[PDB]
Each structure stands twice: as C-alpha cells, then as structure tokens.
Design a protein around this ligand. Structure first.
Ligand code: HEC
Ligand code: HEC
Ligand code: HEC
Length: 81
C-alpha cells in the first residue's frame, strides 16, 4: 500500500495469461528512479501500454529490447506465466 513496491504487480488482460512484474527481482539491480516516474507511474494500471508500444521502447520495452534484457518480442511465458 502507499508508496511501498508490491513484491509482484499483475496486469489483467483477455486471451493471454495475465502479465507479472517482480519488484523483488528488479530491485536487485535498479533504484526506484530508474523506472519511476520516467517509465511507470507510482500507481499500477494508471497508464496502459501494449506489446507494440514495448517494441517502440516504452514500458517493459525500455529495457526488454534484446540488448539490455531479453526482448519483449519473444519469451511470452517469462512475463505471462
Ligand atoms: C522498473 C524495473 C521498476 C523499478 C526499479 C521499481 N518499480 Fe515500482 N513499479 C514498476 C512497474 C512496472 C509497476 C507497475 C505499473 C503498472 O502500469 O501497473 C510498478 C508499480 C509500483 C507502485 C504502484 C503499486 C500499486 O499501485 O499497487 C509503487 C508504489 C511502486 N512501484 C514503488 C516503487 C518503489 C518505491 C521502488 C523503489 C524501491 C520501485 N517501485 C522500483 C517498475 C519499477
Ligand atoms: C515482459 C518483458 C513481456 C514479454 C516478454 C511479453 N509481454 Fe505481453 N505484456 C506484458 C505486460 C506487462 C503487459 C501489460 C502492459 C500494460 O500496461 O497493461 C503486456 C500486455 C500484452 C497484451 C495486451 C496488449 C497487446 O499488445 O495486445 C497481450 C495480448 C500480450 N502482452 C501478449 C504477449 C505475447 C503473445 C508475447 C510474446 C510474443 C508477449 N506478450 C511477451 C509484458 C510482456
Ligand atoms: C530496465 C530498467 C527494466 C525494466 C523497465 C523492466 N525490466 Fe525486466 N528485467 C531487466 C533486466 C536487466 C533483467 C535481467 C536480464 C534478463 O534479460 O533477464 C530483467 C528480467 C526480467 C524477468 C526475469 C526475472 C527472472 O526471474 O530471471 C522478467 C520476467 C521481467 N524482467 C519482466 C519485466 C516486465 C513485465 C517489465 C515491464 C512491466 C519489466 N521487466 C521491466 C530490466 C528491466
């Protein structure tokens, strides 16, 4: 609650399995300001992005571009368990 990062943030959607983001994992390499507010709001579901947006470097795609981290264009299961 509040400004505390949830261990896991879920993204609901139809068709594909919901996506999941782990603060626990990412906090092992990044500080809050490396993602907030430039990439994400300090509020879940405030702004929704698509896989296409990620392909353009937005949302998860800002890092999951095949160079900084595994591409968001593949490995669907990694983020949609
Ligand atoms: C990028 C790798 C992140 C880092 C580093 C941190 N956060 Fe985060 N946070 C991130 C995402 C992808 C999301 C989900 C956004 C969405 O569209 O749903 C979040 C969300 C939060 C929230 C809101 C949670 C909620 O409303 O239930 C908070 C309060 C939050 N994050 C806090 C936070 C803090 C304080 C961090 C440093 C310890 C931190 N996050 C790092 C991505 C990333
Ligand atoms: C983590 C780096 C991801 C990978 C790899 C894939 N997806 Fe994803 N997807 C992810 C998130 C966090 C979200 C929600 C973002 C938000 O702000 O709501 C999504 C969303 C989708 C959606 C809905 C939007 C759209 O593009 O139509 C679908 C249908 C979806 N994702 C499918 C999908 C498939 C099939 C993937 C492999 C080719 C894939 N995603 C990978 C995070 C990540
Ligand atoms: C850069 C600031 C990142 C943002 C924004 C997001 N992720 Fe990430 N993620 C990043 C790195 C450098 C790594 C490690 C290297 C690699 O390629 O794996 C990761 C890893 C993940 C993982 C796997 C975790 C594990 O158990 O090994 C997942 C499933 C993942 N990232 C998902 C994810 C989603 C859904 C994001 C958008 C909401 C997201 N990441 C943003 C760097 C960054």
């Amino acid at each position: 609650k509040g400004m505390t990062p949830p261990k896991t943030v879920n993204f609901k959607m139809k068709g594909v399995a919901d996506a999941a983001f782990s603060h626990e994992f990412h906090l092992g390499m990044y500080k809050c300001n490396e993602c907030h507010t430039k990439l994400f709001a300090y509020k879940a579901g405030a702004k929704r992005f698509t896989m296409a947006d990620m392909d353009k470097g937005k949302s998860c795609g800002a890092c999951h571009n095949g160079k900084d981290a595994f591409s968001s264009a593949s490995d669907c299961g990694k983020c949609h368990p």
